[PDB]
Design a protein around this ligand. Structure first.
Ligand SMILES: COc1cccc([C@@H](C)NC(=O)N2CCN(c3ccncc3F)CC2)c1
Ligand SMILES: COc1cccc([C@@H](C)NC(=O)N2CCN(c3ccncc3F)CC2)c1
Lengths: 377, 383
């Protein structure tokens, strides 16, 4: 009665683990996990597969797949895969496509980070967060089709420009609002660095790579609390604000505040931040700028953005003739990328470069961890 | 594009193996098959189950289940389970509910017959076929909820009445139309007997128990020998392939049993019966005390021949046109809308007086994945 309506409503909902796409993943995964000669000696398994052989072929053909896209260039490599500039053959539309290796994720006991990353991108519904259009999978890989950010990352920008203060003010403010959005979604980022900051066709910020994001209840940018925790300890949204401090320093000064040749040296410097933070005497930087940086680069307890974002927004470093907080993203960016075509990847550095699951002797469920991943916007 | 529309259309279709109910069976089955302590030592399995623990509880609660019905009486027992007169607690509506044991079906290498049985009752869309309203499953059982047939079976009727010819004419004609419907759906019944013939509240026939039904080829034949023997045809005995004509043999037998009161090829032993059936040219003899017309005898004989020359080889028209069926009471286009010979006098909606009174082991906890629920993925059906 109402029960059939209730159940139908669960299945309709795109956030549901039992939506149509998830239920299909369930089927595809089961077939992938069971379709091996050794396992088909079991008559239950063999007859099941025979019954569902035809229909699962049909589905694989109809459903979205890697073959539906043409790979133009690899624009990123990461711990568990790569990012590809692609074009969808039919629509001719250009996207960024993130690939994640199932084998590697399983092998290296790390097979749950993608869920929040997927959800953030699918559902944030925010101009500070990169949009996911499609998520799908093969037997080897998870794929995430996102909107292509042709302006490249902030690491790129800082390496190709001496950044004046007015620019840094803009970018910092955009990072501030972006992080606030993430925080509103109940998330701590945990890895705010310019590698994870991307510029759109109009030179405006969007955040990408949400692989460290956690739902609330490289060391250069890590905060002292997070450092001391990992030997347990707990921490909050203020740890991201530390990283903004670092970011602003890097932009204005051009080196990282706690740079050392080794990683251990850097940790040691960060821990000793009260003494180690020194603005070089040749650095062309305002008092307000220095003030803000220092406000961020304190112990967790007294750090700017402990009492939320307003105190950050109200800081006088951010005073300017060009933009307000309510309209910054709708204003002219410092650097609008000059792009020659829809596949222009000039703001992305070139990249130079496999093993699958072994054929199992019994049921092992290597596809089980990824049931639910598929998403069609 | 159109692909997402094509795929959606597959899932919408109630005949599809990937409809929503089937996809859910898929999930439930996977959880039932994996949720055992030994298997959860595999981290893929354990974490999957943890993720899907809550939502699968929710689903089990929402979905139809045996607990939703109150069992009033067991009205039938069969090879792989039982038939229960039930009442659905909320609606208060009465149904017949057929149960089939998963364990037994698996154990006794017979785990596909129910598919056609389900489909026949779900989709026949015919007054000669018992309507299935719901099909569902537990970890132990398949359930089929059907319309309750309070008039009982023809075995019952024959035992409680000397059946005159006019009656037999009626019931035979109803069986003829019923079998024609089954045949139109592309099916050979293979087990036409009065046990499988049931009377509704108004005393009219519907067929039930489609457990022997087979889908014909594109050439009408079917491919190891089923049935209680009295009603089995010589071709099916000697088999080997056979067609729709083997059901018509059984109608011959049925008509004989109604009119005469014993089976045409009765013997004390089974071997004697087979021997008689095989020798039907000589063995078929109408007893001198039997109340039966020439036309009746003619029809029976027309059915009780070798497959090659049997009535209903050239379809049903020749059967319908046989003069035995001529009468003052009904035509073929309206028979079922005319007054039945015996309207059951029933005291209540749970009256089972036309049903005779009626006088367990589960799957072991498996050490590795074995997929005992896999054979039943797709069974669930909500009309
Ligand atoms: C742990 O596994 C992986 C696998 C691949 C990549 C990564 C990290 C290094 N970077 C990343 O995920 N991204 C998101 C997509 N980014 C865009 C590039 C253009 N357009 C839009 C993007 F979102 C680029 C950075 C980690
Ligand atoms: C092989 O396993 C089984 C298990 C149980 C029953 C059977 C067979 C022997 N009988 C059967 O299927 N039926 C259909 C339901 N029938 C109705 C009874 C009242 N009302 C409506 C019915 F359809 C009564 C006979 C076989």
């Amino acid at each position: 009665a109402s029960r059939q309506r209730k159940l139908e409503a669960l299945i309709r909902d795109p956030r549901s683990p039992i939506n149509v796409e998830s239920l299909l993943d369930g089927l595809n995964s089961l077939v992938l996990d069971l379709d091996f000669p050794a396992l088909r000696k079991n008559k239950n398994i063999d007859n099941f597969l025979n019954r569902y052989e035809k229909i699962v072929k049909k589905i694989r053909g109809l459903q979205m797949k890697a073959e539906d896209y043409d790979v133009v260039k690899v624009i990123g490599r990461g711990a568990f895969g790569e990012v590809q500039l692609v074009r969808h053959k039919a629509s001719q539309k250009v996207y960024a496509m993130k690939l994640l290796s199932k084998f590697e994720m399983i092998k290296r006991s790390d097979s749950a980070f993608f869920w929040e990353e997927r959800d953030i991108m699918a559902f944030a519904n925010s101009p500070w967060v990169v949009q996911l259009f499609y998520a799908f999978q093969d037997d080897r890989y998870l794929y995430m089709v996102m909107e292509y950010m042709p302006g490249g990352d902030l690491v790129n920008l800082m390496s190709n420009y001496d950044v004046p203060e007015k620019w840094a003010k803009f970018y910092t403010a955009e990072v501030v609002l972006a992080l606030d959005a993430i925080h509103s979604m109940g998330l701590i980022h945990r890895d705010v660095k310019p590698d994870n900051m991307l510029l759109d066709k109009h030179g405006h910020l969007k955040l990408a790579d949400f692989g460290t994001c956690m739902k609330m209840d490289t060391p250069d940018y890590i905060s002292p609390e997070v450092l001391k925790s990992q030997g347990d300890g707990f921490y909050g949204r203020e740890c991201d604000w530390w990283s903004v401090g670092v970011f602003l320093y890097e932009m204005l000064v051009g080196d990282t505040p706690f740079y050392a040749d080794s990683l251990v040296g850097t940790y040691s410097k960060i821990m000793d931040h009260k003494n180690s933070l020194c603005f070089p005497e040749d650095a062309e930087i305002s008092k307000h700028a220095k003030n803000l940086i220092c406000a961020f680069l304190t112990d967790r307890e007294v750090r700017l953005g402990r009492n939320g974002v307003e105190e950050i927004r109200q800081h006088p470093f951010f005073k300017n003739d060009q933009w307000h907080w309510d309209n910054i993203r709708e204003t002219a960016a410092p650097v609008v990328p000059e792009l020659s075509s829809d596949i222009d990847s000039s703001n992305f550095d070139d990249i130079e470069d496999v093993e699958t699951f072994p054929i199992p002797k019994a049921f092992v469920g290597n596809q089980l961890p990824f049931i639910g991943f598929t998403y069609y916007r």
